[PDB]
């Protein structure tokens, strides 16, 4: 634990060295494990450089000694402004759930990007319900068993589970993330869901021990009739088709024919 | 014979877009028809392309063909964005290079016509990520660590993802048109290392057995088994990468 006393001071020291290395600097922020204070042994150091020259994007690394290890530290070198504006797009990293990617300011050229910068997150929204390709996915799996490639049926079931959570978060209490392992907490968490959730979702990932095409491909027909008959028909929020033919009941008659 | 309805579904769809769409200059037949590999619960898949900028939209339909129910599916879009996108990697291939099966049901001139009468759109591979697929594996070990059997499996999967953008290079080239062929041809490499086809579906978690353990066993064996496949150069891989990876930094880091 004199290890995180020599990354804290390797985290400062390259701050200092950032600046002088990037004369278009005008932020320094710090990302990640450390950012937030939950590290461990293997955790990287991660940095946001922002500068001013337009359409910059680069990505360094470095590997450096503390004490008796080596540490990884990493840096992405971005335009300020298209850093500031992908706030406005979704995380691919969060199963569709809206996030709080944590940031801690280190170091800003002015008092008014000082002011602009300083904030604990830079905030994304949820991607937006997909009924359509959830429906297809599904299609998938029974195509794959009928021919009996299990490897098909597990692919298209990680596709079911990827998108059931962008049908999940309208219907559950507002919740962001801020990494991708409490993704999954959180999605494991939902208070509203159809009746067994956690093990079919799991299940579908494919994040078990045990499994065969038979209770995965179940899985998914438990979930996507589950899910679709707690969805609001609402065409802004779903799609003008898809909740027209959710009311007309053609879609219950697509999925159960 | 259900397949039969469905052809002449797919010509009486193309007239019916026209008619729909007055600003289309083109409509195309994609997926599993476009292929001519569909079954039973496949999707009637089209792109109607555009001259109105800036549009994106999905439509959807559910319709009857004989004694069955067909969805069929439009993605309408801005013909000049649809033809832009060839410089961006699909997200569904593991970073294959991939050719988007396409066949032109109809174009409104006869110089659309030529610009668009193409077997299949291309999509480059993605580029080496040999700085994400080093920190996916140190998340598995801090999972370990702490005894989280979900953090290994997810990270383990990040892992998986991101092995073929390094294999890529190293094997002869390949594309795909379909995300199960992505599988295929991934599984197919012939040069990869000890044990990589098994490793590689256990660490996507695509078996019907594994354990934390056995996961991040894989996982441990991939990781070092193909970075030291890797050439160092700094146009593939990035400067600092092969800079460290040519000083033996980042096997140190690794392996330390
Ligand atoms: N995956 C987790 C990491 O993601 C990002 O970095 C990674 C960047 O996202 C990676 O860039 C990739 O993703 C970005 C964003 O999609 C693409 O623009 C870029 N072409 C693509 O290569 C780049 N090649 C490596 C860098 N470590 C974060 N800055 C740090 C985080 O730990
Ligand atoms: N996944 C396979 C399907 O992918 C696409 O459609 C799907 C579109 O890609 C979906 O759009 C999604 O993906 C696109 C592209 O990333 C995003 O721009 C968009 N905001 C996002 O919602 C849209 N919401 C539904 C539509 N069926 C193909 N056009 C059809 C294919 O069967
Ligand atoms: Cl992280
Ligand atoms: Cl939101
Ligand atoms: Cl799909
Ligand atoms: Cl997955
Ligand atoms: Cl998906
Ligand atoms: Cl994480
Ligand atoms: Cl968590
Ligand atoms: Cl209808
Ligand atoms: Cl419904
Ligand atoms: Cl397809
Ligand atoms: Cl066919
Ligand atoms: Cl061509
Ligand atoms: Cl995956
Ligand atoms: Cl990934
Ligand atoms: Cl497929
Ligand atoms: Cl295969
Ligand atoms: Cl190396």
Avoid at 43 to 48: G, K
Avoid at 61 to 68: A, F, K, L, R, Y
Avoid at 93 to 100: A, D, E, K, V
Wanted: hydrophobic share 40%; with cysteine; proline share 5%.
């Amino acid at each position: 634990n004199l290890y995180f006393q020599g990354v804290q001071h390797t985290i400062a020291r390259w701050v200092d060295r950032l600046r002088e290395e990037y004369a278009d600097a005008v932020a320094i922020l710090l990302k990640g494990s450390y950012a937030r204070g939950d590290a461990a042994t293997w955790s990287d150091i991660d940095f946001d450089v922002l500068v001013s020259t337009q359409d910059v994007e680069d990505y360094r690394t470095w590997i450096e000694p503390v004490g008796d290890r080596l540490v990884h530290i990493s840096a992405a070198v971005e335009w300020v402004t298209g850093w500031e504006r992908d706030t406005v797009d979704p995380s691919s990293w969060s199963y569709g759930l809206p996030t709080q990617e944590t940031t801690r300011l280190m170091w800003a050229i002015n008092d008014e990007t000082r002011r602009r910068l300083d904030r604990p997150y830079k905030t994304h929204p949820a991607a937006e319900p997909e009924v359509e390709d959830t429906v297809e996915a599904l299609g998938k799996i029974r195509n794959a068993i009928a021919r009996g490639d299990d490897l098909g049926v597990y692919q298209s079931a990680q596709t079911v589970a990827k998108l059931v959570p962008t049908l999940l978060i309208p219907i559950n209490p507002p919740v962001t993330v801020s990494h991708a392992r409490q993704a999954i907490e959180a999605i494991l968490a939902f208070p509203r869901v159809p009746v067994g959730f956690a093990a079919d979702w799991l299940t579908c990932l494919g994040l078990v021990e045990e499994r065969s095409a038979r209770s995965t491909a179940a899985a998914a027909e438990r979930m996507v009739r589950g899910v679709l008959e707690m969805l609001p028909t609402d065409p802004d929020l779903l799609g003008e088709d898809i909740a027209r033919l959710m009311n007309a009941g053609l879609l219950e008659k697509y999925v159960q024919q």
